Every structure is written in C-alpha cells, then in structure tokens.
Ligand binder design. Sequence first.
Ligand SMILES: [Mg+2]
Ligand SMILES: [Mg+2]
Ligand SMILES: [Mg+2]
Ligand SMILES: [Mg+2]
Lengths: 252, 262, 263, 253
Amino acid sequence: AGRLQGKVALVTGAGCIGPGWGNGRAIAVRFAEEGAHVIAVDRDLASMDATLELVRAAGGSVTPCLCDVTDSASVERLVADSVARCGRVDILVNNVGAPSPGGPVALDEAQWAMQLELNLTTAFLMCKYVLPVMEQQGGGAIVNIASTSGIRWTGAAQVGYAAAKAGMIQMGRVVAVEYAAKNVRVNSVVPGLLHTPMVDTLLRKRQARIPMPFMGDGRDTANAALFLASDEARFVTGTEIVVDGGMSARCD
Amino acid sequence: AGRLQGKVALVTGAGCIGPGWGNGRAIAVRFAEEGAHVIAVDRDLASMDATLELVRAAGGSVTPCLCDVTDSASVERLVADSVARCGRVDILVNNVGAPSPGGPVALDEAQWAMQLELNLTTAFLMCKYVLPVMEQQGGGAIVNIASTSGIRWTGAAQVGYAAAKAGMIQMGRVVAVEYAAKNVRVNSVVPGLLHTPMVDTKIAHNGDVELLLRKRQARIPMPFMGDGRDTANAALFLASDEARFVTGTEIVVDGGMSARCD
Amino acid sequence: AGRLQGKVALVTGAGCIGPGWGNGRAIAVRFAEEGAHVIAVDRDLASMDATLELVRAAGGSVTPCLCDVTDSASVERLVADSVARCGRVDILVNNVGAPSPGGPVALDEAQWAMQLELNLTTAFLMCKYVLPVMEQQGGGAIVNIASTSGIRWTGAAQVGYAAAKAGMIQMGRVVAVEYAAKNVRVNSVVPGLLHTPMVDTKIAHNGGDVELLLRKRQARIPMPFMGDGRDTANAALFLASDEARFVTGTEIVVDGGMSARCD
Amino acid sequence: AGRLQGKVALVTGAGCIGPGWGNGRAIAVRFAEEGAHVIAVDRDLASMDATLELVRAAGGSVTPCLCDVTDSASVERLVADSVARCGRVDILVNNVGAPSPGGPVALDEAQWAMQLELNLTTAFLMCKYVLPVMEQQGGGAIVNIASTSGIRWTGAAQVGYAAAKAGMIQMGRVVAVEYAAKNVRVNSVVPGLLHTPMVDTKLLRKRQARIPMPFMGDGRDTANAALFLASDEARFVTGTEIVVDGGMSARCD
Ligand SMILES: [Mg+2]
Ligand SMILES: [Mg+2]
Ligand SMILES: [Mg+2]
Ligand SMILES: [Mg+2]
C-alpha cells in the first residue's frame, strides 16, 4: 500500500522542456509510485511523453491531458472530464509556472501580465473548479508549488514571478482557512534553487547561496509535495515547506 | 523644519468616498504637515476636495491630479508632469487599492483580474515610471500600503485582495534589494482592521452589523480600532530620512491582531 | 525497507504520564515502524513502558535510556554510550519540553529559569554532544519539536515557554546554516494544540470547566478535529528522512490551520 | 513639543564603551531630544558620562542609575525609585545585551547560560517589574532592542545570542497580546549589522557586502526606530518589529 493508495491526483505543468527531474515530472512519477492515479496536465502534450514512460514502466497509472490552465473554460472542462473519468479529484498540485527576467523598469507590462496569469491566476482557476469537487466528495488536498522568489531576493530580478509566487503562497493560506471545515487542506512547497531542465534553459554561483553541499532537483519538491498531499499530513494546512538547502535561513 | 521638509511626495488613492481618515487622505495631510509638497492622485477628482481642505487648513502644500493609475500611459504622463512641475519625486506612496469579497469559487474571474490590477499592478506601474526618476536624482523612498490580508486570514474571504497584497509586500522587498545601491528604499505598511471611509461605508451598507462590528473588534488586542492616521504615521517614518537604513521590510499597524490566533 | 531503514534515532522525552499519543512516544513508534533503531530517552522508565510496548508490538527496535538531559555530564555519557552500543547516531529528536503558566508578572523568576532550561538548554546540550558524532560520521539529521507558542499567542500566558520555543526554532536555523557543510540538517516541527497525555492531563486536572476549555481550544482550529502526537511524528519522520535531504533550516507547522488565521 | 514630550523613559544599557553612536547612547540622546525624561541605566556608571553630557549640552533631562538588571532585587529597587522620583514610567527600552561567539559545540555551557541571562532574562525581569506600573498608570510602551541574529544567520556562529534574541522578539509579541487591554504596547527593533563601538571593539568589508544599501547604519538608526515605536504616533502598533538592517534580511543571494 503506497502513501497515496487509491487517490486521484491532478498535476499541472507535468511536462518538461527536456530530460531530467523537473518539478512536475518528479511529482507525477513520485505520486504514481505511491499508488495515485495521476492526471498529468500540460499545455503541450509531447512534453509529457517522457513523464508517461517513467510512470508506466514502473507499473503506475497516469493519463495525459492537454490544457491551457490560464483559460477558465478549459480548466472547467478539464475538471469535469477528470470527475467523469475518475469519480474524484483527491489531490490537486498547482505546479504550472515559470519566471521572466526584470524588475519594474525592465519587465515589459505585457510580460508582467503574463507572469501574474501563468504563476498565480492558473492556481486560482484550478482552485475555483476543483474546490467544489473536493467539498462534495468529503475533502481533498491542494499543494501549490511556489518558489523562494516569493519570500526573498535570491539573486535575480524577476518581479512578476516574485509577486505572483508570494500571492500564490498567501492564496494557499486563505483558501486553507476558508475550506478547512470541508476537510480540504491547502499547503505550499517553496522550492529554492534547483537543478531542473527549465533551469538548464553559474551553477557554482547558485550553489554558493546554498548551505547544503549539493543542489536539489524536482525529486526534492516532489517528496515535500508527497508528504503534504498524503493523509500523514491530515492536520497540516495553511502552511509551507521550504525546500532550499538552507538558503533562506542565511543572509551572509 | 518638518520631518519631510522640502520633499515631494506622490500619493495614490488620496481621495475618499466620504468624510473621515482614509489611508490616502491621512497620508496626504500628515506628509504635508511635515513639510512635503504632496501630489495627491485619485481616479475621482471630487473625492480629494476634503483632502485638499484638510491640507490647506494645516498650512500645507498639495496639488490634486486626476489619474487612473491602472493605465500605464496615464501613469507615465503623471510622472513626467510631476517632474516637470516639481523637479523631483522624492517619495512615492502606493496606496490605491480596495478589496472585493469572495474565495476562489465565489469571486468572479473578471473581479479577480480587477483585484490584481487595482491592488498590485497599480504599484508595479507607479514603480516602473518613478524608479528611473529616483535613480537619476540620487535616491528616493517608496512606501507600499498593503494589508494584513496579505499575511493572514483576518475574517473574510477576499482571495484576490489577499493574493494581491501579499504580492505587493514581496514586490516591495525585491525592488528594495534591486534598487538599494541607487539609494532607493522600499518598505510596506501593513494595516489591519481600521475605520476608514471605504471600510466603514461597506459595513454600514449591509447579516448582523452589531455582531460583525463586535467580532472585528474582538480580533484586536488593543482597546480601540485605528484609522488612516495610524497608517499615515507609519508611512511617515518609512518615508523619512530617519529611516535611512530601513529597507525591504514592513511595519504592521494592526493593534496586535496578527500576533494572536486564540 | 522503511523510510529510516538502518538509521539510529535518539529521541528525548519518549515517555508519557499516561496512555495516549504524546509527541515523543509517537515519534519513537513511527520511527521504529520505518526501520530506525530508536534510543528512547526519558527521566524515568515507567513513563516509557507503554512506548516500548507499542514499538515492540509493531515489530520495532528500541532501547530505553534514563537521562536528565538538562545535565551536561549525563548527556555526554548518554551520547558516548549510544555510540559505543550502536556505532553512530544518525538522527536526534529534541522533544523534551513542557510549559508553565504565566506572563512576566505572574511567572516566578525560578520557574522562568526552569522553563528556559527544560525547553531550550536541553536541545542546546543534546546538539553540543551529538553534533561531533554526526560531523565525524559524515552527516545526520536533527529535528527539534517546538510549539506554536514560539510563533503566536495561542490563548494562554506562558512567557518562558513562548520565549524558549522561539529560541529553539531559531537555534535550529543557525545550527542548520553552520553545520550544513558537514551534511547535518536541522529543522523544527511546530505543533499547535494537540491531544497528548501531558496536555490533556493538565486540562483535565485543573481553573474552569474542562469541556468549556476544550471547546474554546477547538474553536481556534480551522480543521474539524484536533491532532495528536502521531501528527507531530509524521512531520518529524519526513524531516528526519533522506526524502528531506535538501530541507534544512526551516519548520513544518502542524496545527490544523490555526496560525494562518487571526479572526 | 517633542515627540515624547513629558514622557519618562527608562533605557537599559544606556552606557557605551568607546567613541561613536552605540544603541544605548543614541537612544538616550534621541529620546531626550524629543522631550522625554530619560532614566539612563547601566552596569557601569562611568560609561554613561558622555551620554549625560551630550543630553545636557542640548538642554535635555536625564538621570543616571547604576544597576545590574540581571539581579531582580536591583530591578525592583530601580523601578520603585523611578516611580518615587518621576511618578510614572511611560516607556521602557530593553537595550542590554551582547553576543558571544560559538555554536553549540564551541560555546561553553556557562557562556550559553550567561548569554540567555544577559540578552533575554534581563528583558523578562524589566517587564516583570515595569508592567504593573504601566498597568496601574493607564498604559505604556515597551521597546525591545533585539538583533537580526534572532531571525537569520548573518555571518557568524553565536548560538546563545541568536536563541536569546529570537526569544526576546517572541516574548515581546506575547507580552503585547497579554497586556494590550491595559494599553501597554510592546514592539521590537531588530537592528542588523551596524557600526557601533561594541562592534568596533569586541571584517567591515565582509559585513558591508551583506548590506544592499551603500552604507552601514549606527545606533542613531536603532534610536529612530525605537523613537517611533515608543511614541504616541505608534498608538496602534503592538506585537511587531521594525527591522533596521539596510535590506540585508530580504536577500539570500
Ligand atoms: Mg555569498
Ligand atoms: Mg477610504
Ligand atoms: Mg505527553
Ligand atoms: Mg475565535
């Protein structure tokens, strides 16, 4: 019996631009290893082909779904299809997101809008349509994948990403309080500087910020998300797990 | 010599729907009392009439500007015109904002977009156009007026406001770090539950009002509820040279509310 | 293979005054279920009898030790003897602690001193003697069991406990940064209002109506139930395990949502 | 009318060893400039002489008191004498403190105990004896001078100081909640890496590189934040902190 045995987990941003342990891919793989049926969602189907192979070679259960989760009609259709095919959505992982460079002067206004939409509105829309399902079915768990950029300056200007990710963390807290009585838990993973395929489009420069003598990858995000999504976290809600090698604890 | 003597301060959301100490109005008056020339900005010109009267009764200097600070072309002109008329913009107070009720299910998606735009994009656009002025002139101070809704659930669902105000606090921190070398400081005031015209009008317009007022007061350890004057006094400290080494941080102005969860 | 297979875990405050899921007892049971050999430490054996019974009924491995972990000579001997018996100490759980009522006026100065000693100095001394073992052997994991009283006012005045638990959380962070290069991780669990034998017995043996107090405490928790030591233990298990290899200098709050609200 | 006009402010650690703006010297001077009568307290009486002359050259009101505020009997007498002479204690600034180097292995157990006593028990004892006075008189304001070492690793191991200062910050928050109904406010200043005489005596380049702003503050920065928090302009501010650190704690690059 896996730690998510029999659960249905909807994971956004489950594809990856290249080989390696991206957050979404690692979450899909780890959750399927623990017995969840994974609904793997991405705006590009081909980016999930490698994710599906990893899950299925290990005997896990995963279904790919094409969706633009910035579009509310598409999200509504995705959630309805998930309920139609799987009966329940027990777990939602809001993982879609990506940074764009620049502070308020350099960051173009259109890119600022895209950054808020991709990193924050997506999670809002997924919650809008998944929360009624979780309420009706007796409960559920939501895990937001945020970033240390939402709590610190970590090296680079990226003001839309920083603001959106801070908004994502706080949205998690206030949704947690509002829906706790319906047995819906909401928490965030706050990953730091990880070696993911998106990061690969210097590593010593990022490593110098990390007290631990290595750099994590999507598997580290996935293991924290696994705890928060599981019944072993039944009394954990409205909070975060920072996964950053100690970086945000220091300012030397 | 006042604590802001000779400074030019641009304050958004400086009007109110009615009489009383709104945050923007109180900031405009308090800053003018301390010798700043205030550029008072609002989307409604008449809503600043009372602000102008209070400033001038205090012997202060204020100029009203009609502007929709969600519109970048309008913001760019506002800043260029302020520099042309005043030479400098020493202080920017990002105060425009307003909440709308509802969590992710109840809050209409168009209202979510409006909430992010009004509470967060406005501050981004003001920073976009004021930061080059502050950099060129040798420095400046930015004060964001956020909310305890950005750090806690304080009683009501208002998810766009909560997310936007948390975004505003963090935007302040990252802009502070990026621009510190240019002598630009950025900090937030985090007001809790206050008596301001916009908050009190909404409550009066609507369940059991007596019970709501009591529940709100019960969240505050101090024996009273503050108002815009409290926000203004914290903003004054952060905008002043007495805070020359304070940047990237917040002052919570909430009567002790966020320190408790009993 | 359990999630702590082959690890040696030293857990302080592993006994309880009565039956039920105290934090230390639950940690000992859960860690042993995941394959750790548990060195279960408390002031007296009788409080650990039930802990040992539950560990062993679950097929786990546990050795009881008696120690006053406020006494550095005793701690030094406990660690040296543990290394002699087990070769290593892979995991340290600093769990001993207890609150005493009162703010700065009401709390006696002697009780303030005892509160800092019991809740904070114990963790400092365990780290003093365990860190060299972890450094020499190539790494380790430390989990401090703190309290929401270290981050919020949660209903009751207990200023020594609040200050000590905040100190414990921050000590964890600074030890994490200092020892990260030696592959030692340090994190805290921050439990909220739970059903543990110590908490429940104090409430039951105390001073207005008990049911009124229980309901007042539950009203602070957004979730529709109150957790127990098993919730603390599951968070500690994650933080002690290799699945948290990149997690250090931080906390997991286990409180049903309480500290996220101030309504 | 100064910002503390007519207030009585008891400031611990008001002495200073060496030239420059230490926190205690700067707090005493700034508060007296704003019209407070300052009760300047230190364990070394001579260390306050320059503080007194700076205040008095400006026409301000200050009285020195020799006291070891780790000793509760001495604190009790200090507070009673202050009420007898001044009628009220409106403001308490807990500024005594100092770090000692080392993490849990290196820091001697006796030094750990001294660190908790100096940085945390002192503030507890001052609150124990000042709070009843503030409650009886209708209110008051307490300002704790903590440190960024209570919220971050800032460069050096000093585990007793870090733990004690985190304890001081949280003690302030819980005392704020407990005593708010009595109109007593409690807040902390959280100073970062400052140029103080204490720092200069018992490097500046490494510290400066951690600070986003292009200079390093001193005790005057601590004093200005404490002045705000002690003043009636902060009437609705309680249970919180002002970090005075040039932006350092906002970054981890
Ligand atoms: Mg570095
Ligand atoms: Mg208003
Ligand atoms: Mg117990
Ligand atoms: Mg309540």
